[PDB]
Design a protein around this ligand. Structure first.
Ligand code: ICS
Ligand code: ICS
Ligand SMILES: [Fe+3]
Ligand SMILES: [Fe+3]
Lengths: 522, 477, 522, 477
């Protein structure tokens, strides 16, 4: 039933007695469900060290990964270029997923096309799809550029992107001048961030490899900035803001911030902003090229050093205090621009917040996950705040990366109880938060299910989720915030300390039992 | 708009296409004409998508894993192939269930073999067999395993049928191989069909000799309701207040045992014709079980359905049917009274999957609204047959509509409401056109049954009449 | 007892069995406590309509006010001026309180002095206090200006501020040309915002009243902006940003954003930034003067119109979408500047966020309180979101203001269940959230105690607090937020929709009971 | 630093003052000299503050309402005057209690008569009597009322003593008038004394007409512990493990009945000498109850105190005392072994109210730390006598220090840690100097007793050795 003045959605509608009785009838009648005592008993077992040991012996089975597949990354990279349509060679199902995946995180349109290869293409390859695909895409959506990646179907049958695009130009489906950069992006290799690196080096190659003759390093007095796989609008903006404040000429290469944040003003804008082709063609003339997320830009780096002859500085992601300092100092070195009063003050304001909040943050234990650069920057900042990053999980991490993070832990007394996991997934992480319980999780929306699980063991075992990463699907507009620079450090600090105080307020909200510590002032 | 106006709208829009694409899309766009009732004289469907045109379609894997198998709550479904598919579709579809997730139920979990290039090279059959033992160790209360094949699997010569039979025998376990690779077919649709054949071949016949279940004259199953936001529960409650016994739900909140008991019922009730008419036809020919279509969208269709279903039984069910209809009469009346004035005369354009683009029309009309355009991603001509009956004269029909087309159509027709998917939503909001998600119900619902009509109405009203839509124009231009 | 490796603070230390036993014995033995059933009975009674009717008959008793006294506002106003020392003439106890009150909200130093009047002053008045106070203050803290207000002691005694300051200069305690603006700020009249209004008029009068002869309206091509009582750094900062983006010449009169946010860089800076004396002397030469919070700037308004001859525009606080539009349009009118692409885009981005989030915001019911202009802007914005502002409480509100808000409510269908209360306190509000339960409270930290009371009746009765206002003592760094303009509308919307979604996650987190609706995507 | 370095620091700082202020302040600043043990020969105290110098002092209302009466949990305290005092002191002090707030306990509520100008003009006594009735109606389980006068009450000639007699007699209720107007005295200190006499005159004389209480030889009272962060609870547990019965706690987590029972006890245990030595002297005079000062800060003092107290009784208590000391030995020794290495050699400067500036020295010394500077807001010379005995040779002493002095002293002495109040905390943080709040315990604690020492050590460590302190220097300057 419904009362029209107070309509109930699924929750709490299905709590009504008649729905409840119906659900019990269904269960008892036809579901042949294991008895509740057996369920409780197996649940309890899945929280144990014994279970954890079995869990960690998995070789073939992955459960609840914390990574996605290459072409996702290629699409995001493509979107950062002016009037550029991302185009995935292969099957259309993948493009539906890529679009919806980003739709849900950004709450924006996400434009992408497929050339819809089907079963038939296993006999003859996807050449005709590419010809009709590019012609159709150019005529219909009017991009100034098409950036091509691949699905795994296309990779397994061995389509030659280079030859196919060349043939499409040769047989007059698209003008010879029309830019069609491409990259192979096999999803059984690496992860979504690898797709970004591949796409980017693809595009950089397209505009610079054949024109290196007249290039002169430093002749345009700018610094190229390569952002990598980046899903916070604030992060693109803080980089641009800091460099502008410094009076530093710069070129941000792949810049999706406008097309991921168009106004609702009565018209739909398929394209907005983005790196120009002219900016890519000119980039070898920069002073140097800075990689914001080096641990997934290795192919790009080899190209930039090998062909542009830029000497890529050894910089960590500019996260937290030390690494933001280091970023600014190196940019100052390269550019000749001194660090301005406004940035020095911002820094001192972050440091003030750290002294303000340190007594609540001190010694707090965290489980966290994400992509390698994000995770190590989060680790570093946690250590700066005097927190303990106990469980560090990077599903798509590698050995060398894990050694560098382990080096960062070793240099801090706050690293003593920390462990870095690579190739491990959120079902592994679930075990760790049960057996070696931390105070919070920092992670994406998938972590909400681990929090549910801990709560089920008991309120005292609950580990609350703090949402920072990708994807965040169950809160609105978090994609607008910032995690890089002094600004993102400020945002992260504020989120951490206030999650701690929210949780304390909840634990002390009980009248006469625990509210002796329900302080007005904290 | 007039017929002639719609027809030049179509021609105008198609002028942008290369010649080959234009000739194709022309066959997938039509103006409804009451004098024509054979869709095959009117519109083409279930064809491949033209390359590069930004179809809204998914794939067979989505049709099989995401739609049919995924909701089955006490089996573990393996996404067999590289990491993407299983991750993008993890918990994206709100097929609701009761269960203890990770212990006896596993719907919102993502199990995957996470293919690496080594598996492309040596094949994945040993990894899969190892995967199953590991699943058995770590998730002991699972009552069956399905293997949902992603693109590489068939392409590299793997034999999941062999692994499924061997491991199945060894562990005395129902292990179901599903060949739903994304290159198969042209859309989600072939995935439904493959999924249906898989249930039939590996699950449905297990209790063909078994006779310990106690049947009643009023045994039914709900076929093709995936319990989006609880849709099936708010349907089920009505069938049981009518005195029927709902033995199974396919597959929202469904258990493997329910599915195995289904060949014991007196009557299959098919909501989603497109996704499960296949198994319904099978169950008719093999077990003698008749099936009928119904519609629980809005009070009009729900009352019609309840009566048609009750007529299949004796007077005691027909009497309880009238009791149910009398019980809910003042509730849906209150809803109409409140919301129909706030919605009447508003025009809706729809674009959804293989069922709701026709099925929700009666619910909109129960609120005085008019559906002026509708279309499907993957419907067949039998769907369009049914559609032309439900839809108005001179209304726009589009099959496998392209992004460009849907955008241009909207700009011209200027509906007051669009009802479509997550990839469409944020586009039309920017244009300042009220949008409701008609797959996920925009995280609301149920919309089925009487309790669902109250929510459906509330939802169309809150969005169509929201103060935000007045705001898109800055006063200064 | 403590375990050295897991030290317990008060919570959870006192939950240990021996402490629990000790507390029980104390109670049972010496406290003569009412029996628990009686306490439960009386608590139940305080949640009832019957209790509410008695509560609302109060005339003499006030309980849990939502306002502070005048000189608190005078102090804040005075802090907005360059190298200016707030100086409250009267007794020093007040000044300790004003300082700690602002210390805890801003987590910053708050400089303010007393002239330490005692009982003896009742015979001879506070004149010697004033003479020695100004001399001592000027020599020791080296302000460029001392801005004088009063405590209620001084007011009742009858001290003539103007004479005492003139005599201090006459008798040589401070230089004659040294700026000492003043205002009587009696705490038994109005509230903290009235003190702000009084102090600002006092400073405006000091620098312009005798100098009006050479003034010409418009002659400096600027707009004056008066912010009033403002405790979000982001609000000062967003107004300056918007005007700068517009190319509008402006003078922010009382600007404490620098002195309330100095860097921690090794030195303590007593003063930073602020409105200059030259800006106040030259203010009558502006085109016009815009009052950001007109409902507590009435005295200032009269001076500005009567003396400066400015035609103060009738604008609401620039909060929410409509009123920010109106603010930008009146400023465009006065200044001759067009509204730029940057602000238009920002506005459309806010409107986009509104369409993204409207389904969760719709119909959500709120209780809220604060100062009059803040509360009416919040009411206004809530109505634009499709929310229902059920209990609107403004303790220092008045009849005219209430009418204006009632007008705003009647103009919208979302105003239909809303009631505005003036002269009522948080003990009145507590009854309202019991008898006519809303979904959330928007208010300052005193609201945490109402949330506690509601939870005590039951989880289904709990009304969660959303912290927006002043003071916020139990979370860190929210004072850096913004509530004005499109930026603030964005921030508030985000806080609101995510508080709703946090709460939904909590109610659906129960495994197998309510987590059918624990969606990954919202 | 040497005596002569400190003495020249003092003169240097006082150079900025006008002559009159310099001559006065010089009297309130001194370098400890072990050869002189009469404070009246080396520092002056409890005088008015010089105007305009930014004293850290509060007022008599803060000393009466904020400190002594406000923590009494089952009484309602009326801040009688305009809205300020009552609001700025609402729940700012962490005087912890057990109770049901709003129902039978009222500590963190703000009850006020909210004076308007009409109340100044016509007087506030009618409003006060009306307010009492409303309090009685809406808060029936209160066990008594106090009226804390704010500045205007005495100045306008109100008669709250009369309203209290009349309404008290009418309602058979304890109603306590307290004349703690902030113009009275020179600081919080007179507010203590006023508040103590209010207890003597209106509360304490009430069970002189009652003997139905059962006394034991081991009944004591904790006098002047306001249970900050639980401090009194973690003192009381020790006293009772020693075999004593704590009849009353004054006034942290204090009820009015236990206050009324206090004249029945055998020994008054005084922690805060400054705030409650007055009532202690009176109980000794009127009831013959002896009183003794103790110190529960750090193991050394806590152990000394337990033994000194146990010595007042018989051998059983003295025996249980040693059992207590034996029990906690491994615990406070573990704390020392962990934190003393991390803290030894560090130099602390203190500035607090009336007790802690001397009382916490021993706990710092138990961690190897050195108090190189200390001072009080409102101490009297008998406090400074006790101070000179706790502080080292050549240490800096300061009475009612100015903001200017404190800052200048710190810049020269450069201590590793400062312990002071909220008005100071954010100043010294900007200077890169570790700060701990030594009123509110920085929202931590308890710090009294063995369990408190563990938290104390933890807290000094976490702040002194925090990574944030290394970061204040931008690497580029
Ligand atoms: S199964 Fe089908 S696309 Fe019938 S694949 Fe799709 S949960 Fe749609 S129109 Mo998403 S044929 Fe169901 C459908 Fe309809 S996933 Fe749901 S909304 S009624
Ligand atoms: S009462 Fe006094 S100022 Fe003895 S007014 Fe003050 S809770 Fe201080 S040094 Mo705040 S004489 Fe208590 C004190 Fe000490 S409020 Fe607390 S910390 S031991
Ligand atoms: Fe959006
Ligand atoms: Fe600070």
């Amino acid at each position: 039933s419904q009362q029209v003045d107070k309509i109930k959605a699924s929750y709490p509608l299905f709590l009504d007695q008649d729905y409840k009785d119906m659900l019990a009838k269904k269960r008892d009648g036809f579901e042949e469900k294991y008895p509740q005592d057996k369920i409780d008993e197996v649940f309890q077992w899945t929280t144990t060290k014994e279970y954890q040991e079995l869990n960690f012996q998995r070789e073939a089975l992955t459960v609840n990964p914390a990574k996605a597949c290459q072409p996702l990354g290629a699409v995001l990279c493509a979107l950062g270029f002016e009037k550029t349509m991302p185009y995935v060679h292969g099957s259309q199902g993948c493009v539906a997923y890529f679009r919806s995946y980003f739709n849900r995180h950004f709450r924006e349109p996400v434009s992408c096309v497929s050339d819809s290869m089907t079963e038939d293409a296993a006999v003859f390859g996807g050449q005709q799809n590419m010809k009709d695909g590019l012609q159709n895409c150019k005529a219909t959506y009017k991009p100034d550029m098409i950036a091509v990646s691949t699905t795994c179907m296309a990779e397994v049958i061995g389509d030659d992107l280079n030859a196919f695009i060349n043939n499409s130009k040769k047989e007059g489906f698209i003008p010879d001048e029309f830019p069609v950069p491409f990259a192979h992006t096999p999803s059984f290799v690496g992860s979504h961030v690898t797709g970004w690196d591949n796409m980017f080096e693809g595009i950089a190659r397209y505009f610079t490899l054949k024109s290196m003759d007249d290039k002169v390093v430093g002749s345009n007095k700018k610094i190229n900035i390569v952002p990598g796989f980046e899903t916070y609008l604030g992060n693109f903006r803080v980089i641009k803001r800091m460099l502008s404040e410094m009076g530093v000429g710069y070129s941000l290469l792949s810049d999706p911030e406008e097309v991921l944040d168009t106004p609702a003003d009565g018209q739909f804008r398929m394209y907005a902003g983005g790196t120009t082709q002219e900016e890519m063609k000119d980039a070898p003339n920069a002073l140097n090229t800075v990689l914001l997320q080096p641990w997934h830009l290795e192919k790009t780096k080899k190209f930039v050093e090998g062909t542009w002859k830029h000497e890529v500085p050894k910089l960590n992601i500019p996260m937290g205090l030390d690494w933001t300092d280091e970023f600014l100092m190196k940019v100052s070195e390269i550019s000749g621009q001194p660090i301005p009063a406004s940035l020095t003050k911002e820094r001192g304001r972050l440091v003030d917040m750290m002294t303000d909040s340190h007594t609540w943050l001190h010694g707090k234990r965290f489980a966290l996950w994400g992509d390698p650069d994000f995770v190590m920057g989060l680790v570093k900042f946690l250590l700066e705040l005097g927190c303990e990053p106990v469980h560090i999980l990077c599903h798509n991490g590698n050995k060398r990366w894990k050694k560098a993070v382990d080096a960062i832990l070793a240099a801090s007394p706050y690293g003593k109880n920390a462990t870095v996991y690579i190739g491990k997934d959120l079902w592994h992480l679930r075990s760790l938060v049960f057996t070696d319980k931390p105070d919070f999780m920092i992670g994406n929306s998938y972590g909400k299910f681990i929090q549910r699980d801990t709560l089920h063991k008991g309120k005292e075992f609950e580990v609350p989720l703090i949402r920072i990463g990708f994807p965040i699907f169950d809160r609105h507009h978090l994609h607008r915030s910032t995690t890089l620079g002094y600004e993102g450090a400020m945002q992260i600090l504020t989120t951490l300390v206030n999650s701690i105080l929210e949780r304390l307020d909840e634990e002390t909200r009980g009248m006469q039992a625990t509210d002796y510590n329900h302080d007005l002032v904290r | 708009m007039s017929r002639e106006e719609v027809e030049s709208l179509i021609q105008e829009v198609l002028e942008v296409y290369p010649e080959k694409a234009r000739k194709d899309r022309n066959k997938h766009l039509a103006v409804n004409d009451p004098a024509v009732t054979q869709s095959k004289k009117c519109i083409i469907s279930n064809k491949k998508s033209q390359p590069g045109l930004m179809t809204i379609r998914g794939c067979a894997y989505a049709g099989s894993k995401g739609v049919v198998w995924g909701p089955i709550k006490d089996m573990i479904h393996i996404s067999h192939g590289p990491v993407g598919c299983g991750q993008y579709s993890r918990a994206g579809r709100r097929n609701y269930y009761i269960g203890t997730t990770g212990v006896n139920a596993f719907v919102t979990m993502n199990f995957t073999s996470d293919f690496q290039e080594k598996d492309i090279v040596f094949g994945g059959d040993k990894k899969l067999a190892k995967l199953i033992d590991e699943v058995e160790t770590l998730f002991p209360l699972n009552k069956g395993i399905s293997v949902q094949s992603e693109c590489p699997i068939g392409l590299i010569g793997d034999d999941i049928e062999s692994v499924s039979k061997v491991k199945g025998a060894e562990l005395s376990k129902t292990i179901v191989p599903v060949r739903c690779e994304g290159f198969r077919g042209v859309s989600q649709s072939l995935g439904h069909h493959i999924a249906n054949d898989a249930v039939r071949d590996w699950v449905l016949g297990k209790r063909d000799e078994d006779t310990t279940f106690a049947s009643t004259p009023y045994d039914v199953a709900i076929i093709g309701d995936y319990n989006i936001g609880g849709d099936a529960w708010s349907s089920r409650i009505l069938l049981e207040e009518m005195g029927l016994r709902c033995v199974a739900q396919w597959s929202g909140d469904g258990s493997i045992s329910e599915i195995e008991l289904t060949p014991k019922v007196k009557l299959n009730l098919v909501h989603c014709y497109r996704s499960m008419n296949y198994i319904s036809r099978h169950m008719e020919e093999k077990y003698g079980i008749p099936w009928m279509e119904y519609n629980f969208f809005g009070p009009t269709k729900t009352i019609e359905s309840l009566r048609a279903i009750a007529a299949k039984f004796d007077e005691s069910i027909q009497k309880k049917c009238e009791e149910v209809i009398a019980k809910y009469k003042p509730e849906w009346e209150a809803v109409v009274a409140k919301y129909r004035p706030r919605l009447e005369g508003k025009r809706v354009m729809l674009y959804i999957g293989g069922l709701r683009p026709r099925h929700v029309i009666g619910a909109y009309e129960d609120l005085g609204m008019e559906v002026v355009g509708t279309g499907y991603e993957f419907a067949h001509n039998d769907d369009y047959d049914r559609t032309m009956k439900e839809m108005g004269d001179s209304t726009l029909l589009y099959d496998d509509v392209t992004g460009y087309e849907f955008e241009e159509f909207v700009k011209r027709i200027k509906p007051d409401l669009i009802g479509s998917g997550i990839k469409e939503k944020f586009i039309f909001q920017k244009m300042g056109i009220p949008f409701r998600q008609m797959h996920s119900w925009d995280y609301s619902g149920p919309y089925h049954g009487f309790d669902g009509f109250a929510i459906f109405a509330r939802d169309m009203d809150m969005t169509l009449n929201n103060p935000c839509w007045k705001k898109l124009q800055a006063p200064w231009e």
